[PDB]
Each structure stands twice: as C-alpha cells, then as structure tokens.
Symmetry: C3
Subunit: 429 residues, 3 copies
C-alpha cells in the first residue's frame, strides 16, 4: 500500500491525483493545499471582469476528494525533507511519503516598484475580485488604462485577454472613447508569449490591437507602477512614463519556500522552481516529481528583456499524465517512463470572440501550429470551462474519449515513451 503526497490543489495537483487514483485503486493519495477549493484559473480574467461568480468557477475539495478516496489536508505545506521523505505542514504535521508530487503553482513576484500596492492582478481569485472593485471605480470616472507584463513574466495570455475583454466592456458601456488603453510588455514583440510566437501571432495581435485602438510598447522593462503613471525602461537605458488611472500587470513567477526548503538539488538556485528531467522527475530524488507552473523549464528564447516559458493547461495535463504513469510504473517495477509532449491548445477570450492557438510542441522547432480567431473560439472557451469543472467534480481529468478526440482532430499524443529521462524538460528524448 504505497503513499503519494500531492502538494497543491490546482490543475497540476488535481490532474495528477486523479490520474494516479484511476490507474491504481490500491494506492494511498494525500492532497495538501492551502486553499479549500480548486480554482478554475482560465476563468480568473472573467472573474476580474465581473463576468463570473466565484462559486461557479471553483470547487470545494473537502467534501469532494473523499469521494475518490483521496485524503484532503487543507493546510499550507511549509517544508520538504527529501532525505527523510517527509512534508511538514504549517501547523507542524509531518506526513511521510513514498512519492511526492509538487504542484504548488506560481509564487507571485511583483517586481516593478510599487506594483503590488498600486496595480492590480488577476492571477488568483482573491486578486481578481479586488480588480473588479477597481474596475467599477474606473467606469464611474474613466481615465487612462495601462495593462501588461513586467520583466521575467512567463504567462502573457491572461494579460492580452484582460486587455481585450476590458476593451469589450468599455465599448459595451459606451465609454471606450473616454479610456485610453496601452499594453506594455517584456516580450520582444506582441504575441511572442514567451514561446517565440505561434505562427503569425505577432501579425495577428498587432492587427487586433490596431483595430481596437490598443496602443502598445514591446521590448521594454516596466520598472515602476505609481498611482498616476507606469514607468518603463528601453534597451538603450532610457526611461519613459505613461499616464495611468488603472493598471493591471502580470507578476513574474518563482518557486515557493516549501520547494526552497528541500536541497539545491530540488529547488533551482536561480528561481526556486522544482528541478525536473524530461520525465518531470527530480534528477537526484527519484521519488519527487514536479507538475505545473512550479516546474523549472528553461526559457525557449533569451529575450532582450527577460521572459519565461508558459505552462499552459494542456501542457500541465500532459505532465500530470506522464508523472502518474511514471509513479505507477515505478511502483510496479515497469521500466517504461513517459515524457509529456508539451503541446498546447490555448484560447484567448476577448469578450464575444477569441484567439485560438495550437502549438505542437510549444517549445520549437514545431511540427504544427494553428492560429485562428472568431466567435466560435469564445464559445469553445466557455464550453471547455463547463467541461473541465465537470471533470474535477467527477473524478477523471483524463477520460479516454478526450485523448481520442484530440488525436482525431489535432493528431495529439499527450505522452511519449522516453528511452532516457536525463535532460531538461521539453528537450526531445
């Protein structure tokens, strides 16, 4: 009767726990999370826009997880002793494991001076709801809006979505002509996304912004967010300011102190993210796996202003699939190990229409991309929200038909047999 502990009750943690449970009924699974609910992160921009109720995009874990025989501990994990195979919670409870899955998501870094106090963010439900309050303040007395991403950001999509959604909302309110909008990014160009673009995404987003009168500044470092302005620095070292009554900036991500508490063989010395190989397994502690945003994946491109690689939902579901198979196979002494494909279907909701991006794989060189836009993509976004929430509530994040459908439509194979796990995650084995 083996014991896996999963740290984090989000996309990566839930998917891995559910996968493990469905692969191995005879396996003990403990999920530890500091939030009592699963939060559907792709709906956080909508929540900030006041287009969702929190209750409709979240799932209480305590009455749910026991239905699938998973023990839920609603506590923050404080430290990991990888030599002892132990996790210690904030309350001091020490829980021993045979396998550990770290899926804590991003630790948010508000790197611009004054950002956390003066700006808004949409990365958590709590921050999103705070943003909504500030937006109601904006509608009552319109002023300049600045949205974007600071240096080191690795999740750019929600910023683009939020900007376009806000444009949509101001337009519906008839006050868009009273609200200047500017997008400022650390990406070397619009639609880079920390992935070197997806097809002609640069041309697509530039045209989208031109059509919707969203001014933009790319390839710069946002250095300060003041109550009245945003200050950014270009590559020449020249500083510029842009007026702003309302701002929404993406923080950069780093790993949590719980990961840092394990050795420098577990926590990447540069960013505290979980050191993993191609099989998303720690190179030194073979019973530790990382799933999701918390995993240390090298940037696709060293950009003039530092940027990182996104870990999207599909990428994370593929990691979860690989990790679950990797743990089960180790338990059963099956030598087969899996690397996730790390392909992605991504949809950027703009209001009534949406951008559809497919990248296979996300990390270049690519076999295939799809870049489309239309109303259909918006409805697909909403439909997938309903679908995924159902999956969380029904104990299977990987129903057999889903993989078949993705294979039928997009030739996707989520995981590959990996003959040698040694190497950076995302590198081809």
């Amino acid at each position: 009767a083996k014991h896996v502990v999963v740290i984090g009750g989000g996309v990566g943690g839930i998917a891995t726990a559910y996968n493990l449970r469905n692969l191995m009924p005879d396996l003990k699974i403990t999920l530890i999370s500091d939030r009592p609910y699963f939060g559907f992160t792709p709906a956080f921009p909508h929540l900030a826009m006041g287009w969702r109720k929190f209750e409709d995009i979240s799932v209480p874990l305590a009455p749910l997880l026991p239905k699938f025989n998973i023990e839920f501990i609603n506590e923050k994990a404080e430290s990991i002793d990888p030599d002892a195979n132990t996790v210690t919670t904030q309350s001091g409870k020490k829980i021993e494991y045979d396998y550990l899955v770290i899926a804590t998501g991003p630790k948010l870094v508000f790197g611009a001076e004054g950002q956390e106090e003066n700006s808004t963010s949409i990365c958590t439900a709590e921050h999103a709801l705070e943003t909504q309050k500030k937006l109601q303040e904006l509608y009552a007395n319109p002023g300049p809006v600045v949205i974007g991403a600071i240096p080191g950001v690795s999740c750019f999509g929600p910023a683009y979505e939020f900007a376009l959604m806000l444009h949509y909302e101001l337009k519906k309110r008839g006050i868009r002509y009273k609200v200047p909008m500017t997008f400022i990014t650390s990406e070397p160009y619009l639609g880079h996304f920390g992935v070197g673009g997806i097809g002609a995404s640069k041309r697509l987003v530039e045209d989208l912004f031109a059509e919707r009168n969203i001014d933009w500044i790319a390839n710069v470092a946002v250095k300060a967010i003041e109550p009245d302005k945003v200050i950014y620095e270009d590559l020449n070292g020249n500083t510029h300011e842009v007026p702003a009554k309302f701002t929404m900036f993406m923080p950069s991500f780093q790993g949590p102190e719980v990961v840092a508490s394990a050795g420098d063989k577990v926590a990447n010395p540069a960013n505290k993210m979980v050191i993993v190989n191609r099989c998303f397994q720690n190179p030194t502690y073979k019973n530790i796996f990382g799933v999701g945003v918390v995993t240390a994946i090298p940037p696709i491109e060293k950009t003039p202003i530092p940027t990182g690689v996104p870990k999207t939902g599909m990428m994370i579901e593929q990691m979860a699939m690989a990790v679950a198979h990797n743990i089960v196979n180790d338990i059963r002494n099956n030598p087969d190990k899996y690397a996730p494909r790390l392909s992605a279907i991504c949809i950027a909701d703009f209001g009534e229409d949406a951008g559809f991006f497919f990248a296979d794989p996300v990390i270049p060189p690519r076999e295939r991309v799809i870049t489309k836009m239309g109303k259909w993509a918006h409805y697909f976004k909403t439909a997938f929200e309903k679908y995924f929430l159902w999956k969380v509530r029904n104990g299977n994040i990987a129903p057999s038909f889903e993989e078949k459908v993705l294979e039928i439509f997009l030739k996707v194979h989520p995981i590959e047999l990996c003959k040698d796990c040694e190497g950076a995650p995302g590198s081809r084995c």
Copy 2:
C-alpha cells in the same frame, strides 16, 4: 433679431450658416467670403487630374445665399475687433456682430525652399488647375515623379489620393513603366495621417504602394524643391536628394492675418489659428466660435518630424452643428452646450477603387474604426460629391435623415452634451 457673421464660404462657414438658418429662421446671418463660390475641396485632386471641370464642383454663392435669407458679401475679411464685436473687410466695411464664426480654412505655407515656385499643389481650385497644366507637361515629356508632405503638414489624405490617381492615369496612358514614383512624408510611417493611424492603415497603405510600385520615404523633412530634384533631411540631420521632373507637395497650414488681428486670446501665438475650447468657442470672447481647418487643435502625437491633426469634412460638419446649437442656446438662455463628436468617414479615391477609413472619434481613444478598400468606395466618393453639392444648393447641410442614416450604419452621434467646455478641442468633457 440677433446677428451672426460667418467668415468663410467653405465647408465650415456654409455648414454653420445653414444650420443656424434651419434652427432659427428669424436670425440675421451674414456670410463674408473672398471667393464668389463654394468649392468642393474633396474633388480638388480630381480637378488637378483633369477629371473634373471647375463648374461641376463649385457653387456661385451670390445668387444662392439670398434664397435662404443669408446676406453674402464677396470681400476678404481684413481684421477682427473682438472688444467692439466688429469685423472689417478689405474695402473698409465695418460689420457689427452679436456672434462671430471664423471659418477661413487653411492659410497655406510652402515651407520648403522653392516649393511655391517649382512644385505643384492641389489645396485650392486655382492651384489644382495649375497642377493639371503641369501634368500635361509630364505626359508630354515623361520623367521622375515625387509626391508628399513637408514638415508641419496636417492634411495627408489628398497627397495619397493624388499619388494613386496619378499612378492610375500613367498606367492608363501606358507610360507607368517609364515614370518612377516616390512618396516622401513627414509622417513617421505611411498611413499615419496625423492621427496615429486608422486601424491597420500603415499595413494597408504599405501594401498598396508595394503592389503599385510606389517607392516611399517616411519620417523625413523635405527641405527644398528644385526644378530637377527634391532635397530632404533625415533625423540624423543628413541631407539626401531625389530626381524629379514633376512634384506635388502638401503645404503646411497656419491661421490668417484676420485671426491674428484679434487678441492673442483669439489667435494661437504659435500658428495664428483660432483658440477654441471643447465647444469650439473662444475661452475669452464667448460670442466668438471657430469652425473648420482654422481651429487650433493640438497634435494627436508629437512626431519626430512635426505633424498636425487633419480637420476632415465630417469633423467640420460636426463642429458646425455644435457651434450652431451653442449660439442658438445662448440666444435662448439655455445652459446646455455641445461638443462635436469629431468622428470621420474619410475616403481616399485612387481612380477606379478607393480606401475607406472611418474613425470614431478621429482623436483617440477611439470607440471603433473601419478600414476597407474596394471599387464601391470610389463610387461612394462620387455619390457623396453629388450629394454634398446638392445640399449646398438646397440650403440644408444637415438634413434629419442623414443623422439617422449615419446612426443606423455607423453608430454615429454628431454632437454630445458637454458639461464643461473648459479644455482643448477634442478633449473629453
């Protein structure tokens, strides 16, 4: 029995006078203009191309204006005394006013050395007719053509139209492959138009010029026009030259001496254009209004080579509606004041097809834009020409149906209630 004097028998003056007349049949209205005719400015490029007869795009005003009980004086206004509420003509007639509307249009400044003598222009009917004479010389003895805008230009559209029309003509004459064409502009890029661009106008005009082999140089200052060359200076201060048998350049605009004659409270000290507020009313002398190109509107953006804001026909028409309502409301002891929306439908005629640009408002931030191209837009431009000419001859520049049609097709409302006129024209109340 109140008295309004309108200076200028063009788009702004005629529109304001007609609006006032339809609003207030009992009002005394005197129109002062140095030209005996209304000239339909949007057909001056066509006139230059020899595609119009002068008689077909102009309306004699002396026989016409008495039909709508408007007094017409065919004289140049020489000076304005704002403290005496008087206007003096070149002969010496002192006309007293209760309200004054200044709508003298552009005073042309041929800022490049040799520009007035060696180049051509299409800004007046007289200038356009001379350009046709010079085009015949070009067809007879083919050589290099260069067209564009000098520094400080605010009306770029007709230069693009003219270039494309001339290409069209050259090609029809079978001499295009014998005539090099170069477009040189103070705009930071093609399709800036002095408005920071309209939707994807940059991309659109670039592709247009590329498909038609029109070479271009942007973001430079034309310094001299010689009989055989055009000299321009780049941002690095370096001088360059281009061969030219025929040229056509836009002059920059300033305010007239008649506006300068009034206070520095009326004449903008930097350009002699009329100081107006959001309601197109002088801040100091509240019975003075400005309508049209003569109004001092700040640049949308300060460009590397100085560039100013166009005042297009639709913009002028909205100014005229706003100013007419503001005068009448003052007469009727009504506190309600209006600002024009300053939206624009602009059609650049290219010959057989045309570019259609809609910006609402022209001064950002914008509610929406439409950028289209096709044969239909050329037929629309010709149709509108006939329509507007008819409106001039029939005494109503703003028939009720037109506002309703614009509303249902483009979501345009021409004027808005302004709670606080205090501010720059085009800035939001």
Copy 3:
C-alpha cells in the same frame, strides 16, 4: 548561308538557337556546350530533394540537335577572338562565326570561407545530387539546418524553395520538431529577391516563415561555413555564430574565362559577365550577343549587403527572342532592333503549395505585379516543367500560342522595338 555560333546548351543557348532556326531555316547554327545534356534548372531543387531523377529533367543534345539542323560540339569553349570572329574549344578546334551568342550561364563563386567544402548547393545537377546524399544524413541524425545566400548573390528564389521543400519533407517524415531551421540572407529583408520585392513579397514570405517556424536573419554577410556552424557579420561589423549540422547556401555568380578571353570591351571588369546594351548586343563588337545569366545587368538597387539581379527563365526567353530577331534582321539588312521586355513569372515551389510572383517588368518602374500563393501554383510549376522539356525535345522554345496565351492572361509582350539600343540592359529605349 551565314553562321551563328552559340556557346552554352542551357535555357538561353537552346532558346536562341531554336529561335534562329525557326526564323531562318537555311542559317548555319553551331551550338557548343561542355555538358552533353540540357538540364532543366528549375527542377534542380527538386533533384536535390530526391523528388526527381536526373533523366526526367534533362535532354541529351547530341542525338537531338541534328534533327533541327543544329551542329552540336560537346566541348568547353575556351576562348573568343572577337577581332578574328573565332571561338576556340578546349581541344583546340577553331570555329569561325558571322555572329556569336554567349550563353554560358552562371560561373559559381563559393565566397564564404569553407563554403564549397562544408556546405551544399543546388545550382547544378551535379551539386544538387551531392546535396541529396547529405540530406539523407540529416534525416538519420536530425540537427540544426541553415539555408540562405552569401553576399553578392543574385538568385535567391531557389534558397526559399529549398528551405520550404525541406520543411515539407521533414514534416512528411514526422521529424520537423527535431530540426531547427534558420534562413540567413544578404537581402535587406525577406522576399527582396534582388529586385526590391514583388508587391507584398516581404510580408508574404515573413508570414510564411512564421507559419512554418523558419527562423531568419536578413541584411547580414555570411563569412564562413564550418562543419559545425555558420559565421555571419552584421552591418556594425560584429561577427555572429549560429549552429548548423546541415547547410545549403547559394553561391554568387561571375562570368567565365571564355568571356574574359575576349578582352575588356566584351568582359565586364568587375564580374567577367558579357557587356551588353538594351538589345543584348555587345556595344563594341556588334556581331556578339549575350543571353542569360552570363549577361552583365546592373543591380536594381545597391543594398547594404551587396546583392545582384536575377535573370529568370522568362527574362532569358525574352532575351533569346530579341537576340534571334536582331541577328536575323542584321543578316537581312532590316534596321529594326528589339529589346526584351524582361518581365518574369516566378513560381517558388514549397512542396505541396507554391508562391506565384509576376513582375512586369522586373526592373522598376513596373506596370504591374501579381503575388499569390496556393496549391494551384505547385501544380503549374510541375506542368511547366513537363511543357518546357517537351519544347526542348520538339525544336520550338517559342511556339506562337504561348505568346498569345501570355498576352491573354498577363498582358505580356515579350519584346519591343528599340529606337536606341545604346544604354544599360533593362533601361528603357
């Protein structure tokens, strides 16, 4: 009967010889070529891909040319004595002529250090076959690919074709995700082609490279190709390095030693190409004509990294028609002389689809361009290949219907009466 010697058994030489034969049945015509076959050059990229067999895109000349009363000498022409009106072959045979047509094609210069040794090329059948052999090694052991053009290149299309064909092949083999691809060119931008672009060719090729994940570097000078990497220099003089396991670079072109042997009135000092006027006749020796790539045509523009003008198939067929008429008219004491239009239909085959480019003329000012892309263009490329080879085998490179069909579809007339032959080739009479 008079005697014409044609040096070169390629597109230009065959076209001129056949044009002369059909114009003048009694004319004695001798063709001298070092290759025993006509090679269909536009199928050489396909030969390099292994998509053609050599015998399917070549025609043995010795048994063919006598059927058209053309004497074939399968020898390299070694020298030309223009004063004695003689050509000497490598074996020392002296051939006297009344008129001489020089059509020896490009002499290849592998200007980058280690290029001929470490890279591949597709400019001859023999080189393309070596490339095919090295490609097999890339599929077996996938790694970084870099393709492009060194400084002074004048034929860029085949590099674009080969890059996109290789992408197609790798995607066919399902190994494109293992092969980084980078395009490096002397062109100031993508789709310049040594002609200053064709319509929106830059925008088209950029979007295409983006859609297919082909990275690119333009406006640089490739200095060295090592087994390990490509070294290039930017315009600041800074050297850069890009990793490469397989490369394919275009060489630059010069003229041959046989041309150099005729002295500096015939051989251009800078490149050893044939000095010709508008009528493709040598200015000094009026009985010497040049046809094809070997002709000295000035560049369309001096680019920051030097590039030259392509001589495409259609341009060369037009040169051939003009030269044949010019020779025949001299014989018959007809003072009419012709210049080629020098327009170009260019199809860049990308595998399963293709880019269609049409420029009329290629050298600006242009009457028109067409830039299109689709599957249809690939099928036309294949169809044209079959059609041209048929024409070689059947003794008519200029069937009357082809000129009519080109007139109907593209409004092209291949040659024009030239009232003054004196001037640069491509300059307007």
